[PDB]
Write a protein that binds this DNA or RNA. Structure first.
Ligand SMILES: [Mg+2]
Ligand SMILES: [Mg+2]
Ligand SMILES: [Mg+2]
Ligand SMILES: [Mg+2]
Ligand SMILES: [Mg+2]
Ligand SMILES: [Mg+2]
Ligand SMILES: [Mg+2]
Ligand SMILES: [Mg+2]
Ligand SMILES: [Mg+2]
Ligand SMILES: [Mg+2]
Ligand SMILES: [Mg+2]
Ligand SMILES: [Mg+2]
Ligand SMILES: [Mg+2]
Ligand SMILES: [Mg+2]
Ligand SMILES: [Mg+2]
Ligand SMILES: [Mg+2]
Ligand SMILES: [Mg+2]
Ligand SMILES: [Mg+2]
Ligand SMILES: [Mg+2]
Ligand SMILES: [Mg+2]
Ligand SMILES: [Mg+2]
Ligand SMILES: [Mg+2]
Ligand SMILES: [Mg+2]
Ligand SMILES: [Mg+2]
Ligand SMILES: [Mg+2]
Ligand SMILES: [Mg+2]
Ligand SMILES: [Mg+2]
Ligand SMILES: [Mg+2]
Ligand SMILES: [Mg+2]
Ligand SMILES: [Mg+2]
Ligand SMILES: [Mg+2]
Ligand SMILES: [Mg+2]
Ligand SMILES: [Mg+2]
Ligand SMILES: [Mg+2]
Ligand SMILES: [Mg+2]
Ligand SMILES: [Mg+2]
Lengths: 122, 200, 32, 131, 180
RNA sequence: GCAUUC
RNA sequence: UCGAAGGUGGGAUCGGCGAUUGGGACGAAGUCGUAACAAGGUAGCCGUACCGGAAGGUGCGGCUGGAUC
RNA sequence: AGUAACUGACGCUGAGGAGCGAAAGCGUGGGGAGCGAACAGGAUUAGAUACCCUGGUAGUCCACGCCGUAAACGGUGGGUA
RNA sequence: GUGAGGGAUGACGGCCUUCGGGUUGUAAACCUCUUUCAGCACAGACGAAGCGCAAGUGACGGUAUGUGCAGAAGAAGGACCGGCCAACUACGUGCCAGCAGCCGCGGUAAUACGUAGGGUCCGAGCGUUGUCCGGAAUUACUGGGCGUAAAGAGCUCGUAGGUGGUUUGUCGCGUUGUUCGUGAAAACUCACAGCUUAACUGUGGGCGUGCGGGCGAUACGGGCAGACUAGAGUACUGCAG
RNA sequence: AUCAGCUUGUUGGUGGGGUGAUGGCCUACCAAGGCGACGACGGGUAGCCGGCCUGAGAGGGUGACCGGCCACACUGGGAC
């Protein structure tokens, strides 16, 4: 565009879609889970994926993935939710932190331990 | 912190002498581990990275402190590679090694850290202390007769002493007439790759 | 360009016009 | 309509230089004359003269091509232009091809090149780049 | 001694009734590090034969880079096949600040200090071509002086004359040490 | 003339 | 006299829920056709109008981003 | 286009705005040969709300309004060198 | 800081294997050497040309810091290892359990899953999530586009606005030079000094792009007063549709 | 602008009042003005700055500490 046009209207930057809106600008949000249930991934992949439906202190209902090989969680469990996109799942945007609040660290972990809330063996 | 693990495996990975007296390197000049023989795909990043590793694991400087050295060198008016090398050369543990009172840069660090040297009459136990023009470095009385230092007195000759350094006395007194220019510095490294690494 | 691009728009428009046909009287009664 | 006679002058020069024309005819203006004078002194053109036409004067610029037909002008750019006019302080004068080209700066002292302007410590309007 | 960089290996394929007939292409840059560089594109049924054909085509297309010192003369912008490369001269010590494809051209050209940015297509083949186009737009101050009819002190910046002088001194130094 | 699907 | 809070009144405006209802997106191996891509078996598409379970059909004007000659 | 008789930069473009704007469609009043959405039959087909055939109403035409869309295409804004 | 020097054809044990061995690895064991920082003793501040001049007065504080003693003595973890992107093999489940930032890895031979050995990058930290800038020339002033990729209004006329041919004089508004005032300190940056070094701190320049006042220039833009006919319009004589 | 008109102490004048001081600051009368696509009047959000973070720069984001202004002090009003 001509300079006159720029002077008249200007440049308008692309608006940024606010990601991870349900955290309300927090790094993590505490939540109580209503359902725990397995879910199917998108067509090329096939698995039973452990997922919880979590009511956050932000007053938003969210679906959260449960990372790790084995979980303790059931209804009314208190979990800490962080951001985390699981490509396979269609609507899932948040992951539950292992090792925080009611969620136990996954048993027999020896590598990547800090990401799964397992203490070092003595 | 310091790196206190095996010293040979570092020179072996980098393919160059760091201590320079190491028989186990010349016996096995290939990288360490099970796969140390195997063919490694070439990449410009690995070359740049390994020149940086040669610098910092020669002088014994952690990555945090080394990156501060880079920024100062780049800020300084000279060419960045020369400034970086002569800054690391200004380190007191390095000056002690270049003077000959130590066998290895590791030994030089321990001596300086344990409190055996004085600079312009004041005790300094900071290995990263950067000497300046006309600094005088001396040995405290207690450590002069100290058995490894006695060894150091009569073991003169291991390496040559650079022109900017000078040992003038049997007291093992070190004088610094100036900071070393790139020509004066003699190090098995291509400094231009480290400048490029930090420009990434 | 490819007629594919036109065909996508065609369908959306056609379905909208058909929706407007079916709801014409409803839209009048609910707009009053 | 005609809106920038100097841009027209530069493009007539550029197009003839591409076509390897020996001469360029222009409608005369005193500002075009002074620019042509600078181009002669800096060695980008061979010569220029003022002729008469039916209604006004004409500028004739003779282009300079070296042995083996090699263009003496590599590039010609209109910098200040109507509306978006460009002015430079004497300390911010533009460099053209790292200094191997010329910037033509209009000054209260007259038309000058970036070199002259910087020596005299004067700024002005940046008319064109030549390299 | 010739420095040879293989920039890209691309596995291409024709189709036939029996299936896909695969081939390999290699973009190879060859230079001496003294301001000669050539670019060769080789294609064959196997990777080593493709590289070998690339080397030969590069040597056929050697050209000379105007180098004031260990740096290019002046900033330049080369455009080719949607590829746009900006080259800017740098002070000594800066290093080759360039992207992958442009780095291979400039390292084999022996440029030690340069700033290079790619601003168009990211296709390695066309980035290399754009980089060559930029290097061909570089002009020597001697050639500017002659084409203008002016002396050298009149067409060039004093600081570029200075850097010229010192670089000539180092060439003389290497000639003294080498002939001694 | 007619000839849908995988 | 001015005057906070309070009372009364008719509107503005921003949302939440709502029997019922509209379309949209996605989902595994469901049902019905086969409209488009080859002249896709009636060249396709654009605007508009009427019609038909559905794709879509037909009229009028337009386009080639239409094959064969 | 020719002639330069005349004026003496009066030029260019134009946010908004105004006007014009194929065909279909809409309102009122005329007209209606041919053609022809819808609508009937016939044929084809598994079906045939189609293509093909026989008919056929709005419309196509006129007067005065409205509507303001088209692959309204050179898929290419206007002025000047 | 968690140690340093020496130390073999190279132990045990662990893990691969072409059963040759090869890795861990000079690593370890061992043999000497120095006790920084922690520990146990004994000295012990500056901050106070202060305050009261009555002669006493330091919260921090018996702290910081000196001088002795004992002995390697008390002191390493985290992530990653398909490509980007540095670092590969074996075993265990075989589209499962699971991984993942993107592309994508798991279907009884996986360098991508889990574990182990080995390796790499960082280190009293290492990773993850959230947030902003960068890469992104991907709102493009510097620095992009609109025949077919997203993009020329269906076509005109014209309002505000934007823009302006040749030439003389003048103003000095834009522009440009110079000087003065101001642009607090801190920050930033250059130098130099003080803390054992550094972080940090202090001193002196610069920076503070700006704005205001005085004075200078008049090429270019603009204002003002003129001139000109090549643009634009009119007249006259022909002409095609 | 998916916010186009808003304003009647409102715009201006004179005589009084008021204040430390100028002024519709207040008041009586008189004139019919004033502000708006160089976005008036609305709606949403927000203390501002020296600076900070990022960036080749231009720019983008931001205003914790430290330093300067402003605003408020359970909520609303008032004066002494
Ligand atoms: Mg540290
Ligand atoms: Mg691109
Ligand atoms: Mg079927
Ligand atoms: Mg409902
Ligand atoms: Mg079909
Ligand atoms: Mg068809
Ligand atoms: Mg058919
Ligand atoms: Mg078709
Ligand atoms: Mg029909
Ligand atoms: Mg038709
Ligand atoms: Mg107009
Ligand atoms: Mg318009
Ligand atoms: Mg009609
Ligand atoms: Mg009707
Ligand atoms: Mg009618
Ligand atoms: Mg009628
Ligand atoms: Mg019919
Ligand atoms: Mg009309
Ligand atoms: Mg349209
Ligand atoms: Mg048409
Ligand atoms: Mg169009
Ligand atoms: Mg045009
Ligand atoms: Mg790698
Ligand atoms: Mg940007
Ligand atoms: Mg981003
Ligand atoms: Mg683009
Ligand atoms: Mg265009
Ligand atoms: Mg398009
Ligand atoms: Mg058009
Ligand atoms: Mg106008
Ligand atoms: Mg003009
Ligand atoms: Mg004007
Ligand atoms: Mg300041
Ligand atoms: Mg009064
Ligand atoms: Mg607030
Ligand atoms: Mg940038």
């Amino acid at each position: 565009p001509t300079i006159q046009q720029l002077v008249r209207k200007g440049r308008r930057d692309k608006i940024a879609k606010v990601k991870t809106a349900a955290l309300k600008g927090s790094p993590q949000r505490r939540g109580v889970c209503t359902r725990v249930y397995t879910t199917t991934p998108k067509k090329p992949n096939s698995a039973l994926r452990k997922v919880a439906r979590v009511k956050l202190t932000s007053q938003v209902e969210v679906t959260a993935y449960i990372p790790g090989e084995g979980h303790n969680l059931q209804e009314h469990s208190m979990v800490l939710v962080r951001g985390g996109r699981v490509k396979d799942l269609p609507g899932v945007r948040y992951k539950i932190i292992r090792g925080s609040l009611d969620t136990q660290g996954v048993k027999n972990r020896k590598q990547a331990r800090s990401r799964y809330g397992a203490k070092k063996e003595k | 912190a310091r790196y206190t693990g095996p010293a040979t495996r570092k020179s072996r990975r980098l393919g160059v002498d760091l201590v320079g007296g190491d028989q186990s390197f010349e016996k096995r000049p290939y990288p360490p581990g099970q796969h140390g023989r195997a063919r490694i795909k070439e990449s410009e990043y690995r070359q740049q990275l390994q020149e940086k590793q040669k610098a910092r694991f020669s002088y014994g400087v952690m990555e945090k402190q080394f990156r501060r050295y880079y920024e100062e060198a780049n800020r300084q008016p000279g060419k960045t590679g020369d400034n970086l090398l002569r800054i690391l050369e200004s380190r007191l543990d390095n000056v002690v090694y270049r003077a000959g009172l130590a066998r290895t840069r590791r030994m030089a660090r321990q001596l300086v850290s344990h409190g055996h040297f004085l600079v312009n009459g004041v005790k300094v136990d900071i290995p990263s202390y950067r000497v300046s023009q006309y600094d005088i470095i001396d040995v405290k009385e207690k450590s002069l007769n100290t058995l490894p230092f006695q060894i150091a007195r009569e073991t003169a000759g291991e390496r040559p002493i650079p022109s900017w350094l000078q040992v003038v006395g049997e007291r093992q007194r070190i004088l610094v007439h100036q900071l070393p220019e790139r020509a004066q510095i003699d190090v098995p490294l291509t400094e231009q790759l480290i400048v490029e690494l930090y420009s990434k | 360009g490819s007629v594919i691009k036109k065909r996508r728009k065609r369908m959306s428009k056609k379905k909208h016009r058909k929706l407007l046909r079916r709801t014409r009287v409803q839209r009048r009664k609910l707009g009053k | 309509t005609m809106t920038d006679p100097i841009a027209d002058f530069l493009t007539r020069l550029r197009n003839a230089n591409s076509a390897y024309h020996d001469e360029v005819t222009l409608p005369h203006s005193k500002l075009k004359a002074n620019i042509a004078e600078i181009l002669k002194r800096e060695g980008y053109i061979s010569d220029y003269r003022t002729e008469d036409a039916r209604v006004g004067k004409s500028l004739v610029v003779q282009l300079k091509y070296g042995p083996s037909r090699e263009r003496s002008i590599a590039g010609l750019r209109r910098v200040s232009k109507p509306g978006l006019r460009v002015y430079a302080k004497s300390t911010n004068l533009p460099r053209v091809l790292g200094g191997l080209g010329v910037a033509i700066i209009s000054t209260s002292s007259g038309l000058l090149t970036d070199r002259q302007a910087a020596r005299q410590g004067v700024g002005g309007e940046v008319l064109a780049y030549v390299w | 001694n010739y420095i040879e960089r293989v920039v890209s290996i691309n596995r291409v394929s024709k189709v036939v009734k029996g299936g896909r007939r695969f081939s390999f292409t290699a973009l190879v840059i060859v230079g001496d590090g003294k301001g000669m560089v050539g670019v060769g594109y080789g294609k064959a049924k196997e990777v080593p034969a493709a590289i070998a054909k690339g080397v030969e085509e590069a040597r056929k297309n050697f050209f000379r880079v105007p180098l004031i010192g260990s740096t290019i003369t002046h900033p330049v912008q080369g455009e080719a096949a949607a590829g746009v490369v900006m080259l800017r001269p740098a002070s000594p010590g800066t290093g080759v600040i360039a992207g992958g494809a442009a780095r291979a051209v400039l390292e084999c050209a022996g440029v030690h200090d340069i700033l290079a940015k790619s601003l168009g297509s990211d296709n390695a083949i066309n980035v290399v071509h754009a980089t060559v186009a930029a290097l061909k737009l570089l002009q020597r101050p001697e050639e500017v002086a002659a084409r203008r009819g002016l002396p050298i002190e009149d067409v060039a910046p004093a600081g570029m004359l200075k850097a010229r002088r010192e670089s000539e001194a180092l060439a003389a130094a290497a000639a003294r040490e080498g002939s001694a």
